């Protein structure tokens, strides 16, 4: 039997040490009384869409922040990241004739797993930065001592963000007639800004053709579906935002539409797996180089006993050198046991380089290589490359080569997100041809 | 006051001399009791579409036979001519983002006007061939004496033809997924068969994009609208198929959706103008080089007193050398009097060459020249080039250079119809740009 | 192996004796060159709809003439019979929330099977009247000698009829906003004209609600689907109108969408079964009291080898006293052999009374009794009462008690057709509840 | 020239006195950097819908809290109030065939205007409670001293509320198939719970009929439009959430879709009118007994110079005894000057009784009387009764007879909201009949 708190009985990684247990309890509790970020019916809709992807009739586009922060909470940043998602989706949908399920790593992706539980600088040792939901980035005691009030600040930032995202998606910003205005200024001059300008003109032509045919009024051209997701890492936050569906009595984690378990917290006997095991959400698990096929099958027996094709997204993050060696054996076990999974590629988290400095780098070319290989590997085994899962930004920076080089990892910029979409689009077209 | 027979009181051109008045009366009368080819509501729908064209929001595609015959009455011929119309319409609709109203010169276009009321061959003089509805093409007394039973044979051929055309249009033949199968074999190798193959692939892409967006089920992609038209020349036939709309009590000529008056029978005080003056159909008038602006205005006062923009299609057939000289003055009068008309180009009937032999020729290049000039002239005067009106065939012949060289005029073949559509499509795109 | 003429090698019932074989051949042949009444894609659509009915997700409404005649060929009669079908369908569709497949016994139902191959009146013996497609109703040699020219007259009447029916169905007559105008004058005063007036007001309310919701423009409210059917009795006519689908190369009988075999011509080794065995149409077989379960299974092995749920409609005509005794054993065999069939009730042809006079009567109450029992019997066996199959008229007569009392059988009038629809509607609602 | 702060230069009512100007400035400013509650395109959509109502083609349903509080911030309360709105709208839309524009007094309606700037209890005098956005309800210094941090708490409650409302409206809660589940438990037994149960069954029938017709998939049956509104009273909050539309450069108050000015703050030369004068939102003005026709016209010259029919909602709150005397003269001036306005009835704020105690009462019967009279008055003058504007709750209380009896006014309960909707629905049906 499961309950929203049965995770507290399991061994657990990556949890911060709070100075005041009773204070923490009071905040968990204020938060239990706050409205949910999502409605359970919506999470069932995403499951429905997941089952399409899993059967080879759609593709999953998941993208957003490494880890959102309190210091960067603006409409502009939310809007520009959403623009990049719309761009990518429209490119894939059109070139490949393929529905694309849109999931933002947004409105709740605050917590960070870490290698080390603390950090040392010139003889001083303090608790590690675990994301703004837990503590602050600044190297000083007050910043680093976990503050449970941050749970609420993270909640508030999330309702503001999701509220605006919902409004963009339904209220006209995502209307296909706005296809041009989704290209960010940044993508000004490359051949790229121009490969998209043509695709966009085509879409204009498509829509002109439809009004000429008498289809100018379809709501499906004016709005789109948009879902949110984050790593369920801080189980305090998740529990508090876990609610029963009134219609079915079934528990959903209503902090977001989809939750996923990290590579460092996926212990079969651990708290994170216990938590997500009993919620009705569609969910994911990060699958890195350390996963063998036995563990994988056991993990699936726990997270998808009924072998439902809408339930479980396996997010493969191997590294461009390792994907070829490791993935196949994993696909083959799944095939052999007749399991229904959605396979996605996280081509970022297994390609980060951390130098003694503590400085992180990602070569964008490695990122493309892992993707290209993920598609190759699925081609060969007779299975479906279902999804992509990336960190990206609408901001005008270049973080990958080809706060985000230390505590966080480097995000794709808009140019890079687009080249990737074009690449994915061609491959998908070939798959379907 | 008007009635279905008030035309009989006017002077009249082009009517055959029947040997037995009472026999003719008996047939007119059997035919008055036969069901109508069209339903009055449909004719009102075409008016509606005509008013769109007239306001610059659609374009009229009218095409079919010179004059249908009893000897060529096959599903194959009807199907192939319809294919050519679908091709042309899809090209124009897509390249130009413009609804195209489809009217077939079909299911009733049997009667022929002639220069001369008789014909002489080696000292023998017989009544002229006026179409199979009246008499036969063969040079011999029995053939040439008007036979009123032919009124019925023409009716029967028309219900068979329209019935099949309706079935093609609504029952799946005109479904946009069939876009490739509308190219006739004939159009095998040119760059042309290939310019259309690409446009067709684009359309496939457009439709894939729409099912990816969730629009796979729209009835408007599965069926299309199709209307019929002929020259109301034989007023016996028209009268008999003229019926009252039960809903409104208003008279419609239900032999076809649209009727038109020829260049040789458009006398202001004549029978043809009297007939069409009192029916509710949308209608047309052939406007040739002999029309001045005064006569034109008077004609319009009679055929469209209420200045309704759905009522009246002016079908300009000037000749490629004369269109530039004559049309402008006509447009200007109309503009100056604030009349609502649909302007169309018949670029065929003013470009036929009849040599002493009696052999008729049309140079296709002249045909393109008159069209190109018709568009130019409208460009200059600030008015709308609304339509095209051609004779064409799906059969594998070449009759225009670039029975149909004697009694009839040479039709466009499929290749030629397509080049014309591409040309019209570019021009329309430019108009709208 | 099958061909359009392999029926000529089998023994055969109910065929007329023609005086001139070569004349007959010449007409079969003129007719082979005439366009088809329907397009093969349409017949595949009806199969599709049949498979819905068979699976319990729609209901079949088949209705029209006993046998059309040359003397009654008017738009008014076609229109009024169609009105009665629309009425019935709208009643069933709305009260029961059930799609209704509409099939007219129209545009080809000319031929009549007879008990006796001849008829005697005061010492004179002449060939029996077999419908106007074969010979005339008048008791005299010239009338009664089979005339193959009648094949063409029947064809011509059919294209005229179908052309008009297609126009009504698609061009606005069947638009749901016209729901009131479908009640015929006749149904003036009963409680009945009033039960329908209320249902119609409800429909108005439904449509107002939909335009208030923003659904005013759906093509599915403006037009409806309509199919034709007749007994394939005269195999000369059927063969000539049997054509290959260009797309698939498969033979379809294109005289009508659906064909059926009569109770007197369903010999397993006979010509009629041979003919329909090789066409792609959906088809039916009249199943009367003389059918046992063995014969039934054999018949199905022949007409639906692949056990396709769209293929075969079994039209049960038992008599109100016999339906209870005979039908169950037939259903049970089918169930036991896992066959897919569409079950329909013809509650007319097994309830006709023929007195020594030769005068035929049907008591309408018997008709309702057989239907009510057909539904009861399906209720009990766990199977689906799929359809109704009746003869009816929009004309203002009363032929059933509660030419059509001699050569033909008495048709339901409009009042009676409506009471039946209301009855069927309630029962269907109960089935689905 | 206007700017987001030009209101600060005008004289101003109802503003609280803050102890620390610089602290207040710091909070206004944190809030200026927070994302907006709504997107400007959405506000333009509401204008569009307002112009429909104004032209007599829709009706406005505005309903929600008197004044939201921090102590009642639960998903349950937001959900239940939304249920009551859906109920009311579905009743009106169906019975009357009339689109209903839905505006919630929600996600920002926190501030309260007051009669008196302070309050005295047993010799102690403190600043008056002005809503939780300003200060607390408790009678004590700390509560009553305006606290600018409350601006943020109100913002946070609003994004949480709107986010959930958006999710309900689009994500499946407002799907018309859920029509039954919108009736609150409360409305258990009356004839009323039953008048709605029948209307709901009808809707079920309507939808069954539409899937039978092939319309089961329309997005317009799955989701609905929902807008928010509040009195723009605290101009600090409004200014900070006033942003430029990126597309047009035009200023919108993005705290809500619609803003309105109270009866006590509508001074023509005042700050509130200055603020709303320069934003692009649709807006409203409370029109109470003190308004004459001169002032009204001047007010309209300021708030709708361009006389746009989407811009301005006049919310008439007269009292049931005064509506008859006062409204007509106001309508007549408007008619005479040819002004485009949306007329709505607030039948609550002019019917509150405040006894010496300070205890407020509303008799529900007075409320129905004012509405009924508002419709009568519009009937007589030839103008359109456009809207209703009420305070209501999904909670199981009875506050009107037939915190909310002191600081706030008594809200309609669910039973009462429904009786009102039924009443409005009948009247609207009669108007349209
Ligand atoms: Cl503490
Ligand atoms: Cl790290
Ligand atoms: Cl004669
Ligand atoms: Cl000539
Ligand atoms: Cl003979
Ligand atoms: Cl008989
Ligand atoms: Cl202070
Ligand atoms: Cl007060
Ligand atoms: Co990261
Ligand atoms: Co010609
Ligand atoms: Co019969
Ligand atoms: Co109030």
Of D59, D40, D88, the C-alpha closest to D282 is D40
Q: How far is CA C44 from the centre of its chain?
A: 17
CB atoms within 10 A of CB B13: 15
Backbone angles phi, psi at C6, to 5 degrees: -65, -20
* Separation CA D352–CA D318 (nearest Å): 11
Q: Are C371 and C424 in contact (CB under 8 A)?
A: yes
Tell me, yes or no, whether A388 lies in a domain.
yes
* Separation CA B125–CA B127 (nearest Å): 7
Of D235, D258, D236, the C-alpha closest to D106 is D258
3-class SS string, D175-193: CHHHCCCCCCCCCCCCHHH
Q: Output the DSSP codes for D370-385.
A: HHHHHHHHHHHHT--E
Report chain B's terminal Cα–Cα distance, integer Å. 47
Q: Classify residue D363 by its DSSP letter.
A: B
> Scanning every residue of chain D, which has its alpha carbon at the shortest distance from the alpha carbon of A43?
D171
Longest CA–CA separation in chain C, Å: 73
Helix (H) or strand (E) holding D301: helix D293-303
Say if the Cβ atoms of D208 and C97 lie within 8 Å: yes
User: Which of A31, A149, A171 is best to mutate for the D interface (most D CBs within 10 A)?
Assistant: A171
Say if the Cβ atoms of C34 and B161 lie within 8 Å: no
Paired tokens of C412 = 């339901």
Of C400, C371, C376, the C-alpha closest to C387 is C371
* Separation CA A93–CA A100 (nearest Å): 6
Q: Where are the alpha helices (DSSP H) in D214-270?
A: 219-222, 235-240
The per-type count for chain D, helices as H runs and strands as E runs, is 13, 14
Q: Are strands D312-316 and D251-253 parallel, antiparallel or unpaired?
A: unpaired
- Provide, as residue numbers in chain A, all residues whose Cβ is less than 8 Å from the Cβ of B206: 205-206, 209-210
* Separation CA B184–CA B188 (nearest Å): 8
Tell me, yes or no, whether D202 lies in a domain.
no
| Residue written as token pair 């204009």 | A204
The annotation status of A105 as a binding-site residue, yes or no, is: yes
Paired tokens of A348 = 């970022």
Tell me, yes or no, whether A299 lies in a domain.
yes
- Provide, as residue numbers in chain A, all residues whose Cβ is less than 8 Å from the Cβ of B433: none
Tell me, yes or no, whether C211 lies in a domain.
no
* Separation CA C185–CA C190 (nearest Å): 12
Q: Are A84 and A392 in contact (CB under 8 A)?
A: yes
Tell me, yes or no, whether A247 lies in a domain.
yes
Say if the Cβ atoms of B209 and A93 lie within 8 Å: yes
Say if the Cβ atoms of B167 and C45 lie within 8 Å: no
Q: Are B41 and C172 in contact (CB under 8 A)?
A: yes
Tell me, yes or no, whether B192 lies in a domain.
no
* Separation CA D266–CA A170 (nearest Å): 34
* Separation CA D327–CA D372 (nearest Å): 13
* Separation CA A277–CA A279 (nearest Å): 6
Q: Output the DSSP codes for B87-122.
A: HHHHHHHHHHT--EEEEEE-SS------SSSEEEET
* Separation CA A46–CA C293 (nearest Å): 51
For residue C328, give Cα distances in angstroms to A155, B345, C336, C338.
66, 69, 12, 15
> Scanning every residue of chain C, which has its alpha carbon at the shortest distance from the alpha carbon of B33?
C74
Tell me, yes or no, whether D213 lies in a domain.
no
Domain that holds residue C124: 35-169+225-433
Of A97, A99, A209, the CB nearest to B97: A209
Paired tokens of A137 = 């980035």
Paired tokens of A256 = 């977001």
Q: Where are the alpha helices (DSSP H) in C171-230?
A: 191-213, 219-222
- Provide, as residue numbers in chain D, all residues whose Cβ is less than 8 Å from the Cβ of C218: 215, 218
Measured at the CA of C119, the angle between CA C113 and CA C121, to 5 degrees, comes to 150
The annotation status of A349 as a binding-site residue, yes or no, is: yes
Of B220, B259, B210, B217, the C-alpha closest to B238 is B259
Give the count of alpha carbons within 13 A of B144, CB side only.
14
* Separation CA B283–CA B266 (nearest Å): 13
Backbone angles phi, psi at B18, to 5 degrees: -90, 140
Which chains are adjacent to chain B, needing at least 3 Cβ pairs under 8 Å? A, C
Paired tokens of A179 = 């296809």
Of D226, D227, D225, the C-alpha closest to D254 is D227
* Separation CA A243–CA A260 (nearest Å): 18
Paired tokens of C273 = 């079964």
Angle between helices D364-381 and D323-336 (to 10 degrees): 30
How many domains does chain B contain in total?
1
Q: Are C62 and C260 in contact (CB under 8 A)?
A: no
Angle between helices B191-213 and B75-96 (to 10 degrees): 70
- Provide, as residue numbers in chain B, all residues whose Cβ is less than 8 Å from the Cβ of A206: 205-206, 209-210
Of D205, D212, D220, the CB nearest to C99: D212
Q: Are A168 and A85 in contact (CB under 8 A)?
A: no
Helix (H) or strand (E) holding A391: strand A385-391
* Separation CA A201–CA A185 (nearest Å): 17
Resolution of this entry in Å? Answer: 2.3
Say which experimental method was used: X-ray
| Residue written as token pair 């690449």 | A423
Tell me, yes or no, whether D211 lies in a domain.
no
Q: Are strands D258-261 and D227-231 parallel, antiparallel or unpaired?
A: parallel
Chain B residues with CB under 8 Å of a chain C CB are 33-39, 41-42, 45, 73-75, 78, 156, 159-164, 166-168, 170-173, 181, 219-220, 243, 247
* Separation CA A127–CA A145 (nearest Å): 7
């Amino acid at each position: 039997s499961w309950s929203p708190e049965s995770w507290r009985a399991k061994p657990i990684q990556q949890q911060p040490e709070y100075p005041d247990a009773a204070h923490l309890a009071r905040v968990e509790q204020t938060l239990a009384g706050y409205p949910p970020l999502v409605f359970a019916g919506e999470a069932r809709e995403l499951r429905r869409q997941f089952a399409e992807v899993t059967a080879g009739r759609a593709f999953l586009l998941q993208g957003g922040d490494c880890a959102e922060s309190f210091a960067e909470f603006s409409a502009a940043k939310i809007r520009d990241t959403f623009k990049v998602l719309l761009q990518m989706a429209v490119v894939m949908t059109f070139a490949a004739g393929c529905p694309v399920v849109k999931v933002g790593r947004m409105a709740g992706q605050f917590a960070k797993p870490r290698s080390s539980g603390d950090e040392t600088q010139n003889g001083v040792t303090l608790p590690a930065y675990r994301g703004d939901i837990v503590n602050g980035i600044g190297f000083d005691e007050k910043s680093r001592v976990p503050d449970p009030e941050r749970l609420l600040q993270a909640y508030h930032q999330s309702t503001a963000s999701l509220n605006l995202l919902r409004a963009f998606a339904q209220g006209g910003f995502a209307d296909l007639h706005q296809v041009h205005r989704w290209n960010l200024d940044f993508i000004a001059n490359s051949a790229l800004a121009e490969r998209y300008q043509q695709l966009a003109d085509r879409i204009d032509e498509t829509l002109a053709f439809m009004r000429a045919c008498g289809l100018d009024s379809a709501p499906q051209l004016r709005e789109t579906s948009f879902f949110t997701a984050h790593e369920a890492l801080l189980l305090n936050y998740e529990e508090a935002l876990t609610r029963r569906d009134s219609l079915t009595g079934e528990w959903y984690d209503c902090s977001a539409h989809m939750l996923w378990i990290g590579d460092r917290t996926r212990q079969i006997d651990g708290a994170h797996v216990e938590m997500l095991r009993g919620v009705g959400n569609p969910i994911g698990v990060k699958v890195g180089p350390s996963m063998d096929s036995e563990e994988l099958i056991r993990l699936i027996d726990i997270l998808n006993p009924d072998n439902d094709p809408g339930r479980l997204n396996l997010i493969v993050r191997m590294g461009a050198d390792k994907v070829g060696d490791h993935l196949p054996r994993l696909i083959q076990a799944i095939q052999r046991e007749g399991r229904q999974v959605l396979w996605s590629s996280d081509p970022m988290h297994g390609n980060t380089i951390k130098a003694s400095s503590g400085y992180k780098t990602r070569d964008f070319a490695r990122v493309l290589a892992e993707v290209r290989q993920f598609f190759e590997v699925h081609q060969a085994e007779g299975s479906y490359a279902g999804g992509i899962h990336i960190e990206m930004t609408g901001q005008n920076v270049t973080e990958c080569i080809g706060r985000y080089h230390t505590h966080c990892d480097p995000r794709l910029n808009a140019d890079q997100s687009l080249e990737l979409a074009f690449l994915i689009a061609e491959t998908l077209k070939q798959v379907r041809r």
